[PDB]
Design a protein around this ligand. Structure first.
Ligand SMILES: *[C@@H]1O[C@H](CO)[C@@H](O[C@@H]2O[C@H](CO)[C@@H](O)[C@H](O)[C@H]2NC(C)=O)[C@H](O)[C@H]1NC(C)=O
Ligand SMILES: *[C@@H]1O[C@H](CO)[C@@H](O[C@@H]2O[C@H](CO)[C@@H](O)[C@H](O)[C@H]2NC(C)=O)[C@H](O)[C@H]1NC(C)=O
Ligand SMILES: *[C@@H]1O[C@H](CO)[C@@H](O[C@@H]2O[C@H](CO)[C@@H](O)[C@H](O)[C@H]2NC(C)=O)[C@H](O)[C@H]1NC(C)=O
Ligand SMILES: *[C@@H]1O[C@H](CO)[C@@H](O[C@@H]2O[C@H](CO)[C@@H](O)[C@H](O)[C@H]2NC(C)=O)[C@H](O)[C@H]1NC(C)=O
Ligand SMILES: *[C@@H]1O[C@H](CO)[C@@H](O[C@@H]2O[C@H](CO)[C@@H](O)[C@H](O)[C@H]2NC(C)=O)[C@H](O)[C@H]1NC(C)=O
Ligand SMILES: *[C@@H]1O[C@H](CO)[C@@H](O[C@@H]2O[C@H](CO)[C@@H](O)[C@H](O)[C@H]2NC(C)=O)[C@H](O)[C@H]1NC(C)=O
Ligand SMILES: *[C@@H]1O[C@H](CO)[C@@H](O)[C@H](O)[C@H]1NC(C)=O
Ligand SMILES: *[C@@H]1O[C@H](CO)[C@@H](O)[C@H](O)[C@H]1NC(C)=O
Ligand SMILES: *[C@@H]1O[C@H](CO)[C@@H](O)[C@H](O)[C@H]1NC(C)=O
Ligand SMILES: *[C@@H]1O[C@H](CO)[C@@H](O)[C@H](O)[C@H]1NC(C)=O
Ligand SMILES: *[C@@H]1O[C@H](CO)[C@@H](O)[C@H](O)[C@H]1NC(C)=O
Ligand SMILES: *[C@@H]1O[C@H](CO)[C@@H](O)[C@H](O)[C@H]1NC(C)=O
Lengths: 417, 50, 87, 198
């Protein structure tokens, strides 16, 4: 079939009609980013010649090719630790949450470390981890436990001090006030949260529980990290298997050449294998450098998100998930990071009649903040991202100019307290 | 079947007609002893950078 | 250690800020004298005095200047392969 | 070591060229590394074979150099794009992006020229001396719930004040510093106080 690009939606546009949400939901989405890849290393001389002296001596005639290849892979391995540190080691101190989690109804137990286990992973982190020749593999400087500990510090930091710990000392604040500031930061007044605090905490708690179900249920949920592992695993198997290719030589095995051919002829067959094996190794390294670059880019993005989505509140649309960003919580994953993005999403809009300004005593009044709306009989001024009608007063509006220069201005009363 | 490495007693069971085994990256990882018919694992001879 | 066999460094039970990395959580340093090996800590622990009715507010501030150094360009080399290869 | 980021670029490129030059000394299986020493030793039909061995080797060496230069160039290009972004957002403006223009609350930045690069001096505001205050989400006055207009409600143990969030500077809670919404039976943790009417 010809693919659909999505359902059509005709917006009820007119010069005097505005839709304003009378309700909202809290949405939590999961974004997975690669941070690092396995730090492989291949010793060029051993890969090409093994323990054969006769081959090694011919490989020396190729100058520095092996030195360059060894340096390139070493440089990648070093980068991988840099990438991990840039993403996770953004906190000066290791912060811990209180034994008594009085967070105003907000339940963070699925993102905070689970103390009942030998591990220090949170319930969600356990889900993320459970399902994700001259050749050696080097261990990372920062082990999974250490990465989890950095993550815990970032979570504890955000929960108990909001963004202050990311720009100076950690300053404690009641969680509900932090959240009130986050609402204020997206154009929703603070009283909306306090009046609906029980609802918000419940919507939040439900959304986090949904993350566990999504990750548990969907096998492709972390394909982005699995793909990195599979691509590099395939590259190594491909690399090693080229040792079984003769590349035009009498055989793929150096020992079956040296024990079969007279030295001056054995030399030729070995050169055929050296060229082929060196070429296959160069191919591997070039691919690893290109892949290292895309991993680095992902790590840089992940590091940017850690700073802007976790250590602060972002005003960048769709940078920290869909909807109006409130806060984010990092979670450790194998060779990567998972961000749980908490956003505010308008839920139940209604059709209101609007106007640019209100005409009172021959003067035009505009909202200091908010928009003028009408329910069909009365005019109110309300905040833009949540319907909450107020009487139009001189403390809600400001006056500028006369009523003759505003197109669509309507007549109403502006109350003087 | 030639190479270098460290041979240890294995816990692998070969079929009666199999003489040696291989890994996913078609390299040898076990050999049958022609005289004892026991199976030994072959690990790489230790190496690494300093 | 997981990274390999470390010879000449004295293993201690004291964690410190990482100086020279070895790998797998192990770092080494010169300390009062010999070289020692240890599991690196990540930072000092800090318990935030959180409660449902307590806020910390700065009564003073400082101005800091930090320096960020970024590469912009490479040396513009050009190779004449014919001369390079043959001369 | 402070400018290691720029020195590293210089060193990597210098090494690439030194490596390239010194591959001209390699035989690559040829009778010699020098073309003149091949032509002067072997008859043409054999000299050509030894020359092909050097051409393949030197061409491969050069090609390796170029490939590494393109990968490296992509890295520098990405860094340059970041630097250009910072010039616009840190120097030609004020950033609200955390840790983008240094640690702390960004005020402004000044660029400085450097060899093969740029150095940014990031000027930030950093809170220095915090104190513990008691807080509340709202004040209860006439049954009305009063919320801060732009600050936070704090208490020194006997009196309630409203102050700006990032700097302690307490003010009397007045109707001009607060707004009213809902009532005292809705807000959790609301405290009773007096809101001054000027
Ligand atoms: C936070 O949420 C967790 C669920 O993720 C709650 O733990 C459950 O508590 C019920 C009892 O009401 C038990 O039957 C479940 O087996 C528990 N589940 C898990 C995974 O432990 C926890 O009580 C909530 N905390 C608060 C303060 O509400
Ligand atoms: C705003 O939407 C929420 C749901 O997102 C509403 O809360 C639910 O109300 C129904 C009754 O209609 C209950 O059965 C659900 O259990 C409630 N869910 C939660 C999380 O509390 C809320 O009533 C709506 N508010 C308004 C003004 O429309
Ligand atoms: C627009 O809003 C006003 C204010 O709430 C509504 O007028 C009030 O209606 C209630 C009954 O629900 C009366 O008890 C109040 O005395 C009315 N107030 C005033 C000032 O008249 C009005 O009905 C709403 N209009 C529409 C079309 O919904
Ligand atoms: C708002 O009220 C004013 C009166 O206070 C209206 O002014 C009238 O404007 C028309 C021209 O369109 C004149 O012919 C009338 O004589 C004016 N009336 C008076 C008393 O001077 C104004 O039109 C009203 N605006 C709206 C949108 O209803
Ligand atoms: C909280 O702040 C108030 C206002 O500054 C303090 O009350 C004043 O204390 C000074 C002495 O330092 C007196 O001279 C003023 O007359 C007092 N003003 C009022 C309105 O009482 C109060 O002591 C502070 N409380 C604490 C615990 O520090
Ligand atoms: C704020 O002041 C009101 C009175 O204006 C207090 O109301 C009292 O609440 C208790 C508990 O339900 C009742 O037993 C009293 O009879 C109420 N007083 C009156 C006059 O009705 C309210 O408790 C005060 N809030 C705080 C935190 O002190
Ligand atoms: C607004 O009115 C239009 C009809 O003109 C209708 O299709 C639309 O769904 C209404 N929107 C809301 C939020 O009620
Ligand atoms: C708004 O659009 C209607 C047509 O639907 C038009 O009659 C009316 O004059 C317009 N309002 C203004 C202020 O032009
Ligand atoms: C191998 O030869 C020895 C005699 O030297 C004999 O004892 C042994 O059983 C033989 N191996 C097998 C599998 O029969
Ligand atoms: C560390 O402490 C253990 C006791 O828990 C002790 O047996 C061990 O020898 C100590 N190691 C070092 C290096 O101090
Ligand atoms: C806040 O109170 C705690 C005691 O619970 C104290 O240790 C801490 O130093 C106080 N914070 C400041 C900035 O004085
Ligand atoms: C704050 O916590 C204390 C326990 O230390 C509790 O008694 C009080 O009711 C709580 N107040 C609010 C608003 O949650």
């Amino acid at each position: 079939y010809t693919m659909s690009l999505g359902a059509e939606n005709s917006v009820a546009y007119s010069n005097n009609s505005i839709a304003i949400p009378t309700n909202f939901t809290i949405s939590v989405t999961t974004e997975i980013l690669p941070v690092s890849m396995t730090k492989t290393s291949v010793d060029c001389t051993m890969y090409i010649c093994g323990d054969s002296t006769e081959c090694s001596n011919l490989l020396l005639q190729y100058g520095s090719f092996c030195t360059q290849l060894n340096r390139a892979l070493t440089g990648i391995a070093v980068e991988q630790d840099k990438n991990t540190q840039e993403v996770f080691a953004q906190v000066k101190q290791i912060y811990k949450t209180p034994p008594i989690k009085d967070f105003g109804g907000f339940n963070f137990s699925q993102i905070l470390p689970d103390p009942s286990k030998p591990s220090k992973r949170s319930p969600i982190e356990d889900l993320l981890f459970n399902k994700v020749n001259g050749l050696t593999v080097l261990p990372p400087l920062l082990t999974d436990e250490m990465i989890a500990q950095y993550t815990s510090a970032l979570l504890a930091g955000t929960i108990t001090s909001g963004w202050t710990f990311g720009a100076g000392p950690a300053l404690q604040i009641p969680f509900p006030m932090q959240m009130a500031y986050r609402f204020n930061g997206i154009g929703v007044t603070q009283n909306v949260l306090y009046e609906n605090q029980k609802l918000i905490a419940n919507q939040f708690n439900s959304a986090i529980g949904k993350i566990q179900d999504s990750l548990s249920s969907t096998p492709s949920a972390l394909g982005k990290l699995q793909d990195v592992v599979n691509q590099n695993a395939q590259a190594l198997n491909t690399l090693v298997k080229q040792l079984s290719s003769n590349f035009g030589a009498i055989s793929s095995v150096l020992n079956d050449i040296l024990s079969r051919l007279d030295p001056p002829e054995a030399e030729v067959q070995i050169d055929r294998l050296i060229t082929g094996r060196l070429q296959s190794l160069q191919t591997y390294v070039t691919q690893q450098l290109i892949r290292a670059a895309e991993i680095r880019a992902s790590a840089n993005l992940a590091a940017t998100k850690m700073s802007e989505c976790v250590l602060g509140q972002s005003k960048r649309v769709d940078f920290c998930g869909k909807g109006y960003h409130l806060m984010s919580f990092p979670q450790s994953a194998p060779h990567g990071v998972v961000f749980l993005h908490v956003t505010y999403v308008p839920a139940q809009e209604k059709n209101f009649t609007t106007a640019p300004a209100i005409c009172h005593d021959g003067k035009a009044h505009f909202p200091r903040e908010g928009v003028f709306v009408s329910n069909g009989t009365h005019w109110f001024v309300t905040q833009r991202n949540f319907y909450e009608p107020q009487i139009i007063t001189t403390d809600n509006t400001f006056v500028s100019g006369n009523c003759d220069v505003v197109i669509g201005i309507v007549n109403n009363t502006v109350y003087d307290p | 079947l030639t190479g270098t490495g460290v041979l240890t007693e294995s816990n692998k069971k070969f079929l009666p007609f199999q003489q040696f085994g291989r890994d996913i990256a078609d390299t040898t990882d076990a050999v049958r002893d022609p005289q004892t018919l026991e199976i030994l694992d072959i690990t790489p001879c230790s190496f690494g950078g300093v | 250690t997981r990274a390999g066999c470390l010879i000449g460094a004295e293993h201690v039970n004291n964690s410190y800020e990482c100086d020279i990395p070895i790998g797998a959580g192990i770092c080494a340093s010169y300390q009062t004298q010999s070289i020692i090996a240890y599991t690196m800590s990540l930072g000092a622990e800090n318990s935030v005095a959180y409660s449902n009715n307590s806020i910390a507010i700065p009564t003073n501030f400082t101005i800091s200047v930090t320096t960020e150094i970024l590469p912009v360009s490479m040396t513009k080399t050009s190779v004449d392969c014919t001369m390079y290869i043959c001369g």
